[PDB]
Amino acid sequence: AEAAQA
Amino acid sequence: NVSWNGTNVFGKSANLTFKFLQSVSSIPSGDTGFVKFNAEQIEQAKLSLQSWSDVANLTFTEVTGNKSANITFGNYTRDASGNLDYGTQAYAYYPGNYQGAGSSWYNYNQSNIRNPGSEEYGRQTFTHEIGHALGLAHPGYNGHYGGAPMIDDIAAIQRLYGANMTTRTGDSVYGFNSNTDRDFYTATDSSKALIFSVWDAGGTDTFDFSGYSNNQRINLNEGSFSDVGGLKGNVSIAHGVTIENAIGGSGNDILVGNSADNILQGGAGNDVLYGGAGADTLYGGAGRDTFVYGSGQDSTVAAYDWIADFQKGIDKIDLSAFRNEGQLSFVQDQFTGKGQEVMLQWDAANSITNLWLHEAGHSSVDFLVRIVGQAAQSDIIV
Ligand SMILES: [Ca+2]
Ligand SMILES: [Ca+2]
Ligand SMILES: [Ca+2]
Ligand SMILES: [Ca+2]
Ligand SMILES: [Ca+2]
Ligand SMILES: [Ca+2]
Ligand SMILES: [Ca+2]
Ligand SMILES: [Cl-]
Ligand SMILES: [Cl-]
């Protein structure tokens, strides 16, 4: 699962 | 809940490997235009890894060549269509056995990504991305960005891998004159902003915020936030940590101790010092300072406060909180037994003033503050 940075 | 030890496994340490990719066959997101980490990115990434292994039971060992690694680092520059991407920032993948698990990716077209050592958002991004590659769902000030794990991050990561009890177990100083050898805990001059949540596993420790002229609010309570160097809520103390001492700056500060024995120094300016429970030693510093007492338990005879630099006619001792059970009366040289009485007693031989308070409902006189110097009745706020 992926988490993106703002 | 996921971690490198599996799903729903808590408090289990991990030894992990990491690698700076030199090439790729593909990026798991479909992005393209791979670029390997530069020397500055490498250094800053290692500092970010260190800030995680500082607080939780993790070890990180770099590998190279064709060895696989738990956590990887690489840059991208283009989308799946092959068009330049100057909009996005970074992303990372959870721990697991799937392809690209633990990998983290950063947009090389961003100056903050290329120069994370001089552009604070870059370092913060590394820290957050590593946080996610470790299993954190949602990792993460006048335009500044904290580069290290914050209070909730610390709790969460320790939940997963256990707390690191070997970290800074000696007498540690945070802020100015820091001995931590961590950039995020260190201020070198008054223009340096501090943003951190302190993890500390033992010893007698100090918050040294002496280099600032802003009015500061410094709280030594576990889990509490402080307003430091003119910022707000920029400093905090992680759950499970006891910090003992604090030094304010030249501003008008508030220093709040905890239940431990605290040494509090106001510095210049007009400060409010509150020792709380335990035997505290209080230095108001230059200026008109107020030493606050909120209950009889603040300064029992068996564990009394010292006020070491009291200035008669200038400083104040605040006992107004005792009103709630009857307002205090000043007696000159003897108690009546009625209770709610305050006496200053001069010890000429030692030049110590003993502040005695006989509290309502106490059979004996159980409240004492010892003062190095003279104090007058008009110095006491009842
Ligand atoms: Ca320490
Ligand atoms: Ca400590
Ligand atoms: Ca001050
Ligand atoms: Ca205390
Ligand atoms: Ca002062
Ligand atoms: Ca003073
Ligand atoms: Ca106290
Ligand atoms: Cl490390
Ligand atoms: Cl230390």
Side-chain angles (χ1 to χ4, degrees), chain A, chain B residues 1-128 130-382:
Chain A
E2 195 212 59
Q5 243 265 330
Chain B
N1 296 317
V2 75
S3 72
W4 282 104
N5 290 308
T7 44
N8 297 151
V9 179
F10 310 107
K12 186 179 180 168
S13 83
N15 305 131
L16 303 174
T17 54
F18 69 99
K19 181 181 177 185
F20 301 105
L21 303 181
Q22 297 301 291
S23 67
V24 304
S25 52
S26 69
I27 303 179
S29 62
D31 283 333
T32 61
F34 173 80
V35 175
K36 72 196 188 191
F37 263 33
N38 64 43
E40 183 175 332
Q41 287 183 301
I42 284 171
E43 173 62 4
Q44 292 294 310
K46 288 173 183 172
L47 295 180
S48 286
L49 289 166
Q50 176 173 68
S51 70
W52 286 111
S53 63
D54 268 5
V55 306
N57 270 339
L58 291 162
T59 66
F60 293 112
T61 304
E62 186 181 351
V63 297
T64 56
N66 314 73
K67 316 193 175 185
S68 69
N70 302 120
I71 296 182
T72 69
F73 295 90
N75 305 293
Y76 63 91
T77 50
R78 309 182 84 93
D79 58 24
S81 302
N83 299 318
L84 192 77
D85 173 359
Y86 66 77
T88 67
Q89 172 74 1
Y91 47 91
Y93 296 86
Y94 268 141
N97 289 313
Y98 64 96
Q99 203 65 305
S103 71
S104 67
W105 306 93
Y106 312 80
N107 189 339
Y108 205 66
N109 301 315
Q110 296 283 353
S111 66
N112 82 79
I113 291 304
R114 297 191 304 271
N115 315 307
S118 59
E119 306 183 28
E120 298 179 0
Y121 195 61
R123 168 75 169 278
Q124 175 179 95
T125 300
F126 284 7
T127 299
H128 288 171
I130 295 166
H132 189 257
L134 287 172
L136 300 196
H138 312 106
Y141 304 155
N142 196 29
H144 289 270
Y145 304 89
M150 300 303 281
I151 190 168
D152 293 345
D153 294 326
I154 291 168
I157 199 71
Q158 291 177 336
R159 181 170 142 92
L160 292 181
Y161 301 103
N164 187 347
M165 307 301 302
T166 68
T167 302
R168 291 178 289 277
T169 55
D171 288 7
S172 315
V173 182
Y174 301 87
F176 291 87
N177 306 304
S178 182
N179 61 5
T180 62
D181 187 37
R182 299 290 185 269
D183 56 351
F184 52 91
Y185 286 142
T186 306
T188 44
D189 52 57
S190 57
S191 64
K192 307 312 173 184
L194 288 166
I195 304 164
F196 66 76
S197 191
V198 53
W199 172 251
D200 186 295
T204 300
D205 315 303
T206 304
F207 269 1
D208 179 341
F209 304 138
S210 67
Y212 294 122
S213 61
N214 319 262
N215 297 338
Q216 315 186 80
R217 172 201 171 78
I218 305 170
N219 193 341
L220 291 189
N221 281 287
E222 162 180 0
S224 73
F225 285 78
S226 301
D227 303 332
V228 169
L231 273 46
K232 298 205 169 61
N234 49 321
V235 164
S236 77
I237 296 169
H239 179 251
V241 176
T242 300
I243 306 299
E244 285 77 15
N245 309 323
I247 313 180
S250 64
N252 308 323
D253 308 317
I254 299 165
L255 280 62
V256 177
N258 47 32
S259 69
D261 299 344
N262 309 128
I263 302 180
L264 305 180
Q265 306 172 236
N270 310 324
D271 306 299
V272 175
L273 277 61
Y274 173 88
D280 304 304
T281 306
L282 311 175
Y283 296 84
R288 327 188 80 89
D289 300 296
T290 306
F291 308 88
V292 184
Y293 294 85
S295 87
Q297 297 318 294
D298 282 13
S299 200
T300 65
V301 173
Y304 56 83
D305 275 17
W306 272 108
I307 300 178
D309 70 353
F310 197 78
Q311 284 162 289
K312 177 179 167 188
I314 287 176
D315 293 328
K316 297 292 184 182
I317 297 176
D318 189 324
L319 305 180
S320 60
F322 288 88
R323 285 177 196 156
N324 57 23
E325 49 197 24
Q327 187 160 352
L328 304 175
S329 328
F330 201 82
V331 298
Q332 306 303 316
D333 49 28
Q334 69 201 244
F335 291 116
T336 70
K338 293 173 188 170
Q340 296 301 109
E341 288 174 350
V342 189
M343 177 189 308
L344 293 167
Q345 186 177 340
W346 175 242
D347 174 7
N350 291 300
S351 293
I352 300 300
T353 308
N354 295 317
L355 188 169
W356 296 103
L357 190 166
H358 183 214
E359 200 174 358
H362 290 244
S363 66
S364 52
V365 187
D366 298 322
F367 180 98
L368 169 67
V369 174
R370 303 192 75 201
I371 307 163
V372 187
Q374 300 184 16
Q377 175 181 339
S378 47
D379 292 335
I380 316 299
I381 304 174
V382 292

